[PDB]
Protein backbone atom coordinates (compact mmCIF):
# COMPACT_ATOMS: atom_id res chain seq x y z
CA UNK A 1 0.00 0.00 0.00
CA UNK A 2 0.90 3.69 -0.45
CA UNK A 3 0.83 6.42 2.17
CA UNK A 4 -1.09 9.60 1.39
CA UNK A 5 1.36 11.73 3.36
CA UNK A 6 2.76 14.64 1.39
CA UNK A 7 4.99 17.50 2.39
CA UNK A 8 3.45 20.89 3.12
CA UNK A 9 6.32 23.33 2.73
CA UNK A 10 5.32 27.02 2.37
CA UNK A 11 4.10 27.82 -1.16
CA UNK A 12 4.87 31.09 -2.92
CA UNK A 13 2.84 32.87 -5.63
CA UNK A 14 3.51 31.93 -9.27
CA UNK A 15 4.55 35.55 -9.81
CA UNK A 16 7.27 35.27 -7.16
CA UNK A 17 8.57 31.98 -8.61
CA UNK A 18 8.80 33.66 -12.02
CA UNK A 19 10.16 36.95 -10.68
CA UNK A 20 12.97 35.03 -8.96
CA UNK A 21 13.79 32.99 -12.05
CA UNK A 22 13.93 36.30 -13.92
CA UNK A 23 17.01 37.19 -11.91
CA UNK A 24 18.48 33.66 -11.76
CA UNK A 25 20.79 33.85 -14.81
CA UNK A 26 22.03 37.32 -13.74
CA UNK A 27 22.78 36.02 -10.26
CA UNK A 28 24.95 33.30 -11.81
CA UNK A 29 26.62 35.96 -13.94
CA UNK A 30 27.25 38.07 -10.84
CA UNK A 31 28.90 35.04 -9.23
CA UNK A 32 31.10 34.81 -12.31
CA UNK A 33 31.76 38.57 -12.19
CA UNK A 34 32.68 38.49 -8.47
CA UNK A 35 29.81 40.88 -7.74
CA UNK A 36 29.18 39.74 -4.19
CA UNK A 37 26.70 42.55 -3.61
CA UNK A 38 24.51 41.42 -6.53
CA UNK A 39 24.59 37.82 -5.34
CA UNK A 40 23.85 38.58 -1.69
CA UNK A 41 21.00 40.72 -2.94
CA UNK A 42 19.49 37.95 -5.06
CA UNK A 43 19.75 35.51 -2.17
CA UNK A 44 18.61 37.67 0.80
CA UNK A 45 14.96 37.49 -0.32
CA UNK A 46 14.97 34.29 -2.34
CA UNK A 47 12.61 31.37 -1.88
CA UNK A 48 14.05 28.23 -0.29
CA UNK A 49 14.60 26.77 -3.75
CA UNK A 50 17.02 24.99 -6.05
CA UNK A 51 17.52 28.45 -7.57
CA UNK A 52 18.88 29.78 -4.28
CA UNK A 53 20.82 26.59 -3.52
CA UNK A 54 22.58 26.60 -6.94
CA UNK A 55 23.49 30.27 -6.68
CA UNK A 56 24.74 29.77 -3.14
CA UNK A 57 26.85 26.73 -4.20
CA UNK A 58 28.46 28.48 -7.19
CA UNK A 59 29.02 31.54 -5.00
CA UNK A 60 30.73 29.41 -2.36
CA UNK A 61 33.06 27.84 -4.95
CA UNK A 62 34.00 31.39 -5.96
CA UNK A 63 34.36 32.59 -2.37
CA UNK A 64 36.47 29.59 -1.44
CA UNK A 65 38.85 30.12 -4.35
CA UNK A 66 39.25 33.81 -3.41
CA UNK A 67 39.79 32.92 0.26
CA UNK A 68 36.90 35.14 1.42
CA UNK A 69 36.46 32.88 4.46
CA UNK A 70 34.21 35.12 6.57
CA UNK A 71 31.53 35.42 3.90
CA UNK A 72 32.15 31.75 3.05
CA UNK A 73 31.49 30.58 6.61
CA UNK A 74 28.31 32.68 6.74
CA UNK A 75 26.84 31.33 3.49
CA UNK A 76 28.02 27.73 3.89
CA UNK A 77 25.98 27.66 7.10
CA UNK A 78 22.88 28.54 5.06
CA UNK A 79 23.13 25.48 2.83
CA UNK A 80 21.27 22.26 3.39
CA UNK A 81 23.93 19.58 4.01
CA UNK A 82 22.35 17.25 1.43
CA UNK A 83 22.52 20.14 -1.05
CA UNK A 84 26.19 21.10 -0.67
CA UNK A 85 28.36 20.66 -3.77
CA UNK A 86 31.34 18.38 -3.38
CA UNK A 87 33.83 21.15 -4.01
CA UNK A 88 32.07 23.47 -1.53
CA UNK A 89 32.33 20.67 1.00
CA UNK A 90 36.09 20.41 0.28
CA UNK A 91 36.57 24.18 0.68
CA UNK A 92 34.71 24.11 4.00
CA UNK A 93 36.72 21.19 5.42
CA UNK A 94 39.99 22.79 4.32
CA UNK A 95 39.01 26.00 6.11
CA UNK A 96 38.49 24.00 9.31
CA UNK A 97 41.76 22.11 8.61
CA UNK A 98 39.73 18.88 8.63
CA UNK A 99 41.12 16.30 6.18
CA UNK A 100 38.68 13.46 6.92
CA UNK A 101 37.51 13.41 3.26
CA UNK A 102 41.10 13.07 2.01
CA UNK A 103 41.36 9.29 2.59
CA UNK A 104 38.62 8.66 0.04
CA UNK A 105 39.28 11.60 -2.29
CA UNK A 106 42.90 10.56 -2.76
CA UNK A 107 41.78 7.24 -4.26
CA UNK A 108 40.56 9.27 -7.26
CA UNK A 109 43.28 9.38 -9.90
CA UNK A 110 41.57 11.89 -12.20
CA UNK A 111 40.82 15.62 -12.31
CA UNK A 112 39.00 16.90 -9.21
CA UNK A 113 37.33 20.28 -8.65
CA UNK A 114 39.85 22.94 -7.52
CA UNK A 115 38.69 23.02 -3.87
CA UNK A 116 39.00 19.23 -3.68
CA UNK A 117 42.38 19.25 -5.38
CA UNK A 118 43.71 21.80 -2.86
CA UNK A 119 42.36 19.86 0.12
CA UNK A 120 44.48 16.90 -0.95
CA UNK A 121 47.55 19.10 -1.35
CA UNK A 122 47.14 20.53 2.14
CA UNK A 123 46.59 17.06 3.60
CA UNK A 124 49.73 15.88 1.80
CA UNK A 125 51.85 18.65 3.33
CA UNK A 126 50.45 17.72 6.75
CA UNK A 127 51.65 14.14 6.41
CA UNK A 128 48.01 13.07 6.48
CA UNK A 129 47.90 11.18 3.15
CA UNK A 130 48.56 7.46 2.81
CA UNK A 131 51.82 7.41 0.83
CA UNK A 132 50.78 4.61 -1.51
CA UNK A 133 47.47 6.27 -2.43
CA UNK A 134 49.11 9.67 -2.72
CA UNK A 135 51.77 8.57 -5.22
CA UNK A 136 49.20 6.51 -7.13
CA UNK A 137 47.22 9.74 -7.59
CA UNK A 138 50.35 11.55 -8.80
CA UNK A 139 50.92 8.89 -11.50
CA UNK A 140 47.25 8.88 -12.51
CA UNK A 141 47.34 12.64 -12.94
CA UNK A 142 50.57 12.35 -14.91
CA UNK A 143 49.10 9.69 -17.16
CA UNK A 144 45.92 11.75 -17.55
CA UNK A 145 47.80 14.87 -18.66
CA UNK A 146 46.95 16.79 -15.50
CA UNK A 147 50.60 17.70 -15.21
CA UNK A 148 50.13 20.79 -13.08
CA UNK A 149 48.05 18.95 -10.46
CA UNK A 150 50.61 16.12 -10.45
CA UNK A 151 53.41 18.68 -9.93
CA UNK A 152 51.72 20.39 -7.02
CA UNK A 153 50.81 17.14 -5.29
CA UNK A 154 54.37 15.77 -5.62
CA UNK A 155 55.69 19.06 -4.24
CA UNK A 156 53.22 18.88 -1.33
CA UNK A 157 54.35 15.32 -0.56
CA UNK A 158 57.89 16.62 -0.05
CA UNK A 159 59.45 15.24 -3.24
CA UNK A 160 58.93 17.69 -6.15
CA UNK A 161 59.50 16.90 -9.85
CA UNK A 162 62.97 18.46 -9.62
CA UNK A 163 64.26 17.09 -6.33
CA UNK A 164 66.32 14.05 -7.25
CA UNK A 165 64.11 11.72 -5.21
CA UNK A 166 60.79 10.06 -6.08
CA UNK A 167 59.15 13.06 -7.73
CA UNK A 168 61.85 13.52 -10.34
CA UNK A 169 61.69 9.79 -11.05
CA UNK A 170 57.88 9.70 -11.36
CA UNK A 171 58.00 12.68 -13.72
CA UNK A 172 60.76 10.95 -15.70
CA UNK A 173 58.47 7.97 -16.40
CA UNK A 174 56.46 10.12 -18.88
CA UNK A 175 58.69 8.73 -21.63
CA UNK A 176 56.66 5.56 -21.05
CA UNK A 177 53.28 6.59 -19.60
CA UNK A 178 52.69 9.83 -21.49
CA UNK A 179 49.45 10.15 -23.46
CA UNK A 180 51.37 9.87 -26.74
CA UNK A 181 54.40 7.92 -25.53
CA UNK A 182 52.17 5.06 -24.34
CA UNK A 183 51.14 4.50 -27.95
CA UNK A 184 54.72 3.90 -29.12
CA UNK A 185 55.60 0.35 -30.33
CA UNK A 186 58.75 0.67 -28.21
CA UNK A 187 56.98 1.74 -25.03
CA UNK A 188 57.25 -1.82 -23.74
CA UNK A 189 60.93 -2.08 -24.69
CA UNK A 190 61.79 1.22 -23.01
CA UNK A 191 60.03 0.27 -19.80
CA UNK A 192 61.78 -3.12 -19.79
CA UNK A 193 65.20 -1.43 -19.77
CA UNK A 194 64.72 1.04 -16.96
CA UNK A 195 62.63 -1.41 -14.92
CA UNK A 196 65.71 -2.03 -12.77
CA UNK A 197 65.72 1.52 -11.40
CA UNK A 198 61.96 1.49 -10.84
CA UNK A 199 60.01 0.73 -7.67
CA UNK A 200 57.51 -2.14 -7.59
CA UNK A 201 54.73 0.50 -7.55
CA UNK A 202 56.10 2.45 -10.52
CA UNK A 203 56.53 -0.73 -12.60
CA UNK A 204 53.01 -1.92 -11.91
CA UNK A 205 51.47 1.43 -12.85
CA UNK A 206 53.53 1.73 -16.07
CA UNK A 207 52.58 -1.71 -17.38
CA UNK A 208 48.99 -0.78 -16.50
CA UNK A 209 49.18 2.27 -18.74
CA UNK A 210 50.48 0.23 -21.66
CA UNK A 211 47.92 -2.55 -21.23
CA UNK A 212 45.11 -0.03 -20.75
CA UNK A 213 45.87 1.58 -24.10
CA UNK A 214 46.04 -1.74 -25.97
CA UNK A 215 42.91 -3.00 -24.25
CA UNK A 216 40.82 0.07 -25.02
CA UNK A 217 42.03 -0.26 -28.63
CA UNK A 218 40.72 -3.83 -28.58
CA UNK A 219 44.14 -5.35 -29.23
CA UNK A 220 43.45 -8.09 -26.69
CA UNK A 221 46.54 -10.36 -26.85
CA UNK A 222 48.88 -7.38 -26.51
CA UNK A 223 46.80 -5.98 -23.64
CA UNK A 224 46.89 -9.22 -21.69
CA UNK A 225 50.63 -9.45 -22.25
CA UNK A 226 51.28 -6.00 -20.77
CA UNK A 227 48.75 -6.35 -17.96
CA UNK A 228 50.34 -9.74 -17.24
CA UNK A 229 53.50 -7.92 -16.15
CA UNK A 230 51.64 -5.91 -13.47
CA UNK A 231 52.93 -7.30 -10.16
CA UNK A 232 50.72 -5.22 -7.86
CA UNK A 233 47.30 -4.81 -9.49
CA UNK A 234 46.09 -2.47 -6.73
CA UNK A 235 48.45 0.17 -8.11
CA UNK A 236 46.26 0.38 -11.23
CA UNK A 237 43.74 3.22 -11.67
CA UNK A 238 40.09 2.08 -11.69
CA UNK A 239 39.94 2.49 -15.49
CA UNK A 240 43.15 0.48 -15.95
CA UNK A 241 41.93 -2.43 -13.87
CA UNK A 242 38.47 -2.47 -15.44
CA UNK A 243 40.11 -2.57 -18.86
CA UNK A 244 42.29 -5.46 -17.64
CA UNK A 245 39.06 -7.23 -16.72
CA UNK A 246 37.53 -6.26 -20.06
CA UNK A 247 40.46 -7.81 -21.92
CA UNK A 248 40.17 -11.03 -19.94
CA UNK A 249 36.43 -11.04 -20.58
CA UNK A 250 36.83 -10.60 -24.31
CA UNK A 251 39.43 -13.38 -24.40
CA UNK A 252 37.15 -15.61 -22.28
CA UNK A 253 39.92 -16.14 -19.71
CA UNK A 254 37.60 -16.82 -16.78
CA UNK A 255 40.30 -17.67 -14.23
CA UNK A 256 42.24 -14.49 -14.95
CA UNK A 257 39.03 -12.40 -14.95
CA UNK A 258 38.10 -13.65 -11.46
CA UNK A 259 41.65 -12.98 -10.22
CA UNK A 260 41.60 -9.41 -11.58
CA UNK A 261 38.18 -8.64 -10.03
CA UNK A 262 39.44 -9.93 -6.71
CA UNK A 263 42.06 -7.16 -6.82
CA UNK A 264 39.54 -4.35 -7.52
CA UNK A 265 38.56 -1.76 -4.91
CA UNK A 266 35.61 -3.13 -2.93
CA UNK A 267 33.28 -0.50 -4.44
CA UNK A 268 34.14 -1.74 -7.96
CA UNK A 269 33.77 -5.37 -6.90
CA UNK A 270 30.29 -4.59 -5.65
CA UNK A 271 29.06 -2.90 -8.84
CA UNK A 272 26.44 -4.77 -10.92
CA UNK A 273 29.00 -5.25 -13.72
CA UNK A 274 31.67 -7.09 -11.75
CA UNK A 275 29.21 -8.91 -9.53
CA UNK A 276 27.72 -10.42 -12.73
CA UNK A 277 30.94 -11.15 -14.58
CA UNK A 278 32.51 -12.69 -11.47
CA UNK A 279 29.44 -14.92 -11.18
CA UNK A 280 29.77 -15.88 -14.88
CA UNK A 281 33.42 -16.65 -14.18
CA UNK A 282 32.52 -18.90 -11.23
CA UNK A 283 29.79 -20.60 -13.27
CA UNK A 284 32.21 -21.12 -16.12
CA UNK A 285 34.75 -22.81 -13.84
CA UNK A 286 32.31 -25.12 -12.07
CA UNK A 287 31.89 -23.15 -8.85
CA UNK A 288 28.11 -23.11 -9.08
CA UNK A 289 27.24 -22.36 -5.47
CA UNK A 290 29.55 -19.38 -5.41
CA UNK A 291 28.07 -18.25 -8.76
CA UNK A 292 24.49 -18.48 -7.50
CA UNK A 293 25.37 -16.32 -4.51
CA UNK A 294 26.91 -13.62 -6.71
CA UNK A 295 23.98 -13.66 -9.16
CA UNK A 296 21.74 -13.04 -6.19
CA UNK A 297 23.84 -10.06 -5.13
CA UNK A 298 23.83 -8.73 -8.69
CA UNK A 299 20.07 -9.21 -9.15
CA UNK A 300 19.49 -7.24 -5.94
CA UNK A 301 21.12 -4.06 -7.27
CA UNK A 302 17.89 -2.99 -8.99
CA UNK A 303 16.39 -2.81 -12.48
CA UNK A 304 19.64 -2.44 -14.41
CA UNK A 305 21.19 -4.43 -17.31
CA UNK A 306 23.33 -6.74 -15.17
CA UNK A 307 20.65 -7.18 -12.49
CA UNK A 308 18.36 -8.55 -15.20
CA UNK A 309 21.02 -10.77 -16.74
CA UNK A 310 21.88 -12.16 -13.28
CA UNK A 311 18.17 -12.73 -12.67
CA UNK A 312 17.98 -14.84 -15.81
CA UNK A 313 20.89 -17.02 -14.71
CA UNK A 314 18.73 -17.76 -11.66
CA UNK A 315 15.66 -18.67 -13.73
CA UNK A 316 13.92 -15.44 -12.71
CA UNK A 317 12.45 -13.57 -15.65
CA UNK A 318 11.41 -9.92 -15.67
CA UNK A 319 7.98 -9.26 -14.17
CA UNK A 320 6.50 -5.80 -14.69
CA UNK A 321 3.48 -6.21 -12.36
CA UNK A 322 3.45 -3.29 -9.88
CA UNK A 323 3.95 -4.35 -6.25
CA UNK A 324 2.21 -1.19 -5.05
CA UNK A 325 -1.14 0.46 -5.79
CA UNK A 326 -1.52 3.62 -7.89
CA UNK A 327 -0.96 6.88 -6.04
CA UNK A 328 -4.32 8.25 -4.91
CA UNK A 329 -5.69 11.24 -6.81
CA UNK A 330 -6.08 13.23 -3.64
CA UNK A 331 -2.41 12.63 -2.74
CA UNK A 332 -1.31 13.65 -6.24
CA UNK A 333 -3.33 16.91 -6.06
CA UNK A 334 -1.99 17.64 -2.58
CA UNK A 335 1.64 16.82 -3.57
CA UNK A 336 1.27 19.59 -6.18
CA UNK A 337 0.29 22.03 -3.41
CA UNK A 338 3.65 21.62 -1.64
CA UNK A 339 5.70 24.79 -2.02
CA UNK A 340 8.81 23.10 -3.38
CA UNK A 341 6.93 20.81 -5.78
CA UNK A 342 4.60 23.66 -6.86
CA UNK A 343 7.57 25.88 -7.67
CA UNK A 344 8.87 23.12 -9.94
CA UNK A 345 5.49 22.63 -11.66
CA UNK A 346 5.23 26.40 -12.06
CA UNK A 347 8.62 26.77 -13.79
CA UNK A 348 7.82 23.75 -15.97
CA UNK A 349 4.36 25.07 -16.95
CA UNK A 350 5.73 28.47 -17.91
CA UNK A 351 8.69 27.04 -19.82
CA UNK A 352 6.24 25.25 -22.12
CA UNK A 353 4.07 28.29 -22.80
CA UNK A 354 7.16 30.49 -23.18
CA UNK A 355 9.31 27.97 -25.06
CA UNK A 356 12.18 28.56 -22.63
CA UNK A 357 14.54 25.56 -22.64
CA UNK A 358 16.62 27.06 -19.82
CA UNK A 359 13.58 27.59 -17.58
CA UNK A 360 12.64 23.94 -18.14
CA UNK A 361 16.10 22.83 -16.98
CA UNK A 362 15.76 24.89 -13.81
CA UNK A 363 12.37 23.26 -13.27
CA UNK A 364 14.14 19.89 -13.38
CA UNK A 365 16.55 21.28 -10.80
CA UNK A 366 13.64 22.37 -8.65
CA UNK A 367 12.08 18.92 -8.93
CA UNK A 368 15.28 17.21 -7.73
CA UNK A 369 15.47 19.68 -4.85
CA UNK A 370 11.77 19.33 -4.00
CA UNK A 371 11.88 15.53 -3.88
CA UNK A 372 15.27 15.19 -2.16
CA UNK A 373 15.01 12.78 0.75
CA UNK A 374 11.49 11.72 -0.20
CA UNK A 375 10.66 8.22 1.08
CA UNK A 376 9.48 5.70 -1.55
CA UNK A 377 5.76 6.50 -1.12
CA UNK A 378 6.33 10.24 -1.65
CA UNK A 379 8.58 9.46 -4.62
CA UNK A 380 5.80 7.39 -6.20
CA UNK A 381 3.23 10.06 -5.44
CA UNK A 382 5.41 12.81 -6.93
CA UNK A 383 6.07 10.61 -9.98
CA UNK A 384 2.35 10.47 -10.80
CA UNK A 385 2.14 14.18 -10.11
CA UNK A 386 4.87 14.83 -12.69
CA UNK A 387 3.20 12.47 -15.13
CA UNK A 388 -0.14 14.24 -14.79
CA UNK A 389 1.44 17.61 -15.66
CA UNK A 390 3.24 16.11 -18.68
CA UNK A 391 6.61 16.46 -16.87
CA UNK A 392 7.55 13.03 -18.26
CA UNK A 393 11.27 12.88 -17.47
CA UNK A 394 10.68 13.75 -13.79
CA UNK A 395 7.94 11.11 -13.65
CA UNK A 396 10.52 8.52 -14.76
CA UNK A 397 13.35 9.90 -12.65
CA UNK A 398 11.26 9.98 -9.43
CA UNK A 399 9.78 6.51 -9.95
CA UNK A 400 13.17 4.90 -10.63
CA UNK A 401 14.64 6.22 -7.37
CA UNK A 402 12.71 3.75 -5.23
CA UNK A 403 14.29 0.41 -4.17
CA UNK A 404 11.50 -1.79 -2.74
CA UNK A 405 8.31 -0.19 -4.05
CA UNK A 406 8.02 -0.67 -7.80
CA UNK A 407 5.72 1.08 -10.25
CA UNK A 408 6.79 -0.17 -13.68
CA UNK A 409 4.21 1.91 -15.56
CA UNK A 410 5.86 5.08 -14.21
CA UNK A 411 9.48 3.84 -14.49
CA UNK A 412 8.77 2.82 -18.11
CA UNK A 413 6.19 5.33 -19.34
CA UNK A 414 4.99 5.12 -22.94
CA UNK A 415 3.50 8.38 -24.21
CA UNK A 416 2.98 8.99 -27.98
CA UNK A 417 2.16 5.29 -28.29
CA UNK A 418 0.06 5.30 -31.42
CA UNK A 419 2.67 7.42 -33.16
CA UNK A 420 5.70 5.38 -32.05
CA UNK A 421 4.09 2.00 -32.71
CA UNK A 422 3.07 3.07 -36.23
CA UNK A 423 6.45 4.48 -37.28
CA UNK A 424 8.23 1.46 -35.74
CA UNK A 425 6.01 -1.01 -37.59
CA UNK A 426 6.46 0.95 -40.84
CA UNK A 427 10.24 0.36 -40.86
CA UNK A 428 9.96 -3.14 -39.40
CA UNK A 429 11.55 -2.58 -35.95
CA UNK A 430 10.63 -3.60 -32.39
CA UNK A 431 8.51 -0.94 -30.63
CA UNK A 432 9.97 -2.07 -27.29
CA UNK A 433 13.44 -1.32 -28.63
CA UNK A 434 12.29 2.08 -29.93
CA UNK A 435 10.78 3.01 -26.56
CA UNK A 436 13.93 1.71 -24.91
CA UNK A 437 16.04 4.07 -26.99
CA UNK A 438 13.79 7.10 -26.44
CA UNK A 439 13.76 6.62 -22.67
CA UNK A 440 17.58 6.75 -22.69
CA UNK A 441 18.00 9.45 -25.38
CA UNK A 442 15.55 12.08 -24.17
CA UNK A 443 13.60 10.67 -21.19
CA UNK A 444 10.52 11.50 -23.33
CA UNK A 445 11.12 15.28 -23.55
CA UNK A 446 9.80 16.40 -26.97
CA UNK A 447 11.99 19.51 -27.03
CA UNK A 448 15.15 17.77 -25.84
CA UNK A 449 18.44 19.13 -27.20
CA UNK A 450 21.94 17.68 -26.76
CA UNK A 451 25.15 19.70 -26.78
CA UNK A 452 26.26 17.81 -29.92
CA UNK A 453 23.11 19.27 -31.51
CA UNK A 454 21.02 16.07 -31.39
CA UNK A 455 17.33 16.95 -31.60
CA UNK A 456 14.07 15.77 -30.07
CA UNK A 457 12.74 12.55 -28.55
CA UNK A 458 15.10 10.37 -30.57
CA UNK A 459 18.02 12.81 -30.56
CA UNK A 460 18.59 12.72 -34.30
CA UNK A 461 9.69 14.19 -47.53
CA UNK A 462 10.66 17.57 -46.00
CA UNK A 463 13.61 17.82 -43.59
CA UNK A 464 12.03 20.31 -41.18
CA UNK A 465 9.83 17.55 -39.74
CA UNK A 466 12.82 16.68 -37.50
CA UNK A 467 11.53 19.19 -34.95
CA UNK A 468 7.98 17.89 -34.62
CA UNK A 469 7.41 14.78 -32.50
CA UNK A 470 5.89 12.99 -35.51
CA UNK A 471 8.78 13.86 -37.81
CA UNK A 472 11.40 13.22 -35.13
CA UNK A 473 10.04 9.75 -34.46
CA UNK A 474 9.66 9.05 -38.17
CA UNK A 475 13.32 9.96 -38.75
CA UNK A 476 14.70 8.28 -35.61
CA UNK A 477 13.03 4.95 -36.37
CA UNK A 478 14.10 5.08 -40.04
CA UNK A 479 17.70 5.66 -38.94
CA UNK A 480 17.44 2.87 -36.35
CA UNK A 481 16.36 0.54 -39.22
CA UNK A 482 18.91 1.79 -41.74
CA UNK A 483 21.74 1.55 -39.21
CA UNK A 484 20.62 -1.94 -38.32
CA UNK A 485 20.58 -2.93 -42.00
CA UNK A 486 24.15 -1.61 -42.36
CA UNK A 487 25.38 -3.56 -39.37
CA UNK A 488 24.53 -7.13 -40.36
CA UNK A 489 21.00 -6.65 -39.05
CA UNK A 490 22.22 -6.92 -35.46
CA UNK A 491 20.39 -4.88 -32.80
CA UNK A 492 23.30 -4.58 -30.42
CA UNK A 493 25.52 -3.15 -33.18
CA UNK A 494 22.67 -0.95 -34.36
CA UNK A 495 22.26 0.48 -30.87
CA UNK A 496 25.99 1.22 -30.61
CA UNK A 497 25.93 2.61 -34.15
CA UNK A 498 22.98 4.91 -33.50
CA UNK A 499 25.04 6.53 -30.73
CA UNK A 500 28.62 6.38 -32.09
CA UNK A 501 28.20 5.87 -35.83
CA UNK A 502 28.17 2.57 -37.70
CA UNK A 503 31.86 2.92 -38.60
CA UNK A 504 32.84 2.76 -34.95
CA UNK A 505 30.34 -0.01 -34.13
CA UNK A 506 31.88 -2.15 -36.88
CA UNK A 507 35.38 -1.25 -35.73
CA UNK A 508 34.54 -2.72 -32.27
CA UNK A 509 33.59 -6.12 -33.70
CA UNK A 510 36.10 -8.96 -33.24
CA UNK A 511 37.36 -11.39 -35.88
CA UNK A 512 35.22 -14.02 -34.14
CA UNK A 513 31.61 -13.83 -32.97
CA UNK A 514 31.09 -12.10 -29.60
CA UNK A 515 28.42 -12.71 -27.01
CA UNK A 516 26.29 -9.55 -27.03
CA UNK A 517 26.90 -8.58 -23.38
CA UNK A 518 30.63 -9.07 -24.01
CA UNK A 519 30.65 -6.76 -27.05
CA UNK A 520 28.66 -4.20 -25.01
CA UNK A 521 30.88 -4.30 -21.90
CA UNK A 522 34.02 -3.91 -24.02
CA UNK A 523 32.91 -0.89 -26.06
CA UNK A 524 35.87 1.54 -25.89
CA UNK A 525 33.75 4.73 -25.50
CA UNK A 526 32.37 4.98 -21.96
CA UNK A 527 29.28 6.93 -23.08
CA UNK A 528 28.36 4.44 -25.80
CA UNK A 529 29.10 1.48 -23.55
CA UNK A 530 26.68 2.77 -20.90
CA UNK A 531 24.07 3.74 -23.56
CA UNK A 532 23.89 0.27 -25.11
CA UNK A 533 23.36 -1.49 -21.79
CA UNK A 534 20.60 0.95 -20.77
CA UNK A 535 18.79 0.84 -24.08
CA UNK A 536 18.74 -2.94 -24.19
CA UNK A 537 17.71 -3.18 -20.52
CA UNK A 538 14.94 -0.63 -21.16
CA UNK A 539 13.79 -2.61 -24.19
CA UNK A 540 13.29 -5.80 -22.16
CA UNK A 541 11.14 -3.87 -19.70
CA UNK A 542 9.03 -2.32 -22.45
CA UNK A 543 8.50 -5.70 -24.13
CA UNK A 544 7.08 -7.09 -20.88
CA UNK A 545 4.75 -4.12 -20.40
CA UNK A 546 3.63 -4.39 -24.02
CA UNK A 547 2.81 -8.06 -23.52
CA UNK A 548 5.11 -9.12 -26.35
CA UNK A 549 6.17 -12.79 -26.56
CA UNK A 550 8.76 -13.15 -23.78
CA UNK A 551 12.35 -12.73 -24.93
CA UNK A 552 15.14 -13.04 -22.38
CA UNK A 553 17.53 -10.10 -22.30
CA UNK A 554 20.40 -12.55 -22.81
CA UNK A 555 18.62 -13.64 -26.02
CA UNK A 556 17.97 -10.01 -26.99
CA UNK A 557 21.73 -9.44 -26.68
CA UNK A 558 22.25 -12.58 -28.81
CA UNK A 559 25.48 -12.99 -30.75
CA UNK A 560 27.45 -10.19 -32.42
CA UNK A 561 28.89 -11.57 -35.69
CA UNK A 562 32.57 -11.58 -36.63
CA UNK A 563 33.61 -8.86 -39.04
Author numbering: 41 to 500, 514 to 616
From the manuscript:
Lytic transglycosylases (LTs) degrade peptidoglycan (PG) to produce N-acetylglucosamine (GlcNAc)−1,6-anhydro-N-acetylmuramic acid (MurNAc)-peptide (G-anhM-peptide), a key cytotoxic elicitor of harmful innate immune responses. The crystal structure of the outer membrane lipoprotein LtgA, a homolog of Slt70 that belongs to family 1A of GH family 23 from the pathogenic Neisseria species, was previously determined at a resolution of 1.4 Å.. Briefly, LtgA is a highly alpha-superhelical structure consisting of 37 alpha helices. The active site of LtgA is formed by ten alpha helices (α 28, 29, 30, 31, 32, 33, 34, 35, 36, 37), with a six-alphahelix bundle (α 29, 30, 31, 32, 33, 34) constituting the core of the active site that firmly secures the glycan chain.
In the course of monitoring the LtgA reaction in the crystalline state, we captured a native version of LtgA with a distinctly disordered alpha helix 30. This represents a newly identified conformational state of LtgA whereby alpha helix 30 transitions from an ordered to a disordered state. Interestingly, this disorder of alpha helix 30 did not affect the overall structural integrity of the active site because all the other helices making up the catalytic domain remained intact. Moreover, LtgA was already shown to be active in the crystalline state in our previous studies, although the molecular details of alpha helix 30 interactions with the ligand was not addressed. In this study, we identified a variant of LtgA with a disordered active site alpha helix 30, which is important for PG binding and for the catalytic mechanism of LtgA. When LtgA, missing the alpha helix 30 motif, was expressed from an ectopic locus in N. meningitidis (at an elevated level compared to wild type), bacterial growth, cell division and daughter cell separation were disrupted, compromising the integrity of the cell wall and PG composition, and diminishing bacterial fitness or virulence in a mouse infection model. In our ΔltgAltgAΔ30 strain, we observed significant defects in growth, cell division, cell separation, cell membrane irregularities, and fibrous and membranous extra cellular material, which were noticeably absent in the wild type, ΔltgA, and the ΔltgAltgA strains. However, the PG of the ΔltgAltgAΔ30 strain was found to be markedly hyperacetylated when compared to that of the other strains, with a 102% increase in the amount of acetylated GlcNAc-anhMurNAc-tetrapeptide (GM*4), a 39% increase in acetylated GlcNAc-anhMurNAc-tetrapeptide crosslinked with GlcNAc-MurNAc-tetrapeptide (GM*4-GM4), and a 46% increase in doubly acetylated di-GlcNAc-anhMurNAc-tetrapeptide (GM*4 GM*4). LtgA enhances the activity of Ape1 and an impaired LtgA results in a dysfunctional Ape1, and appears to poison the cell wall machinery with devastating effects toward the survival of Neisseria in the host.
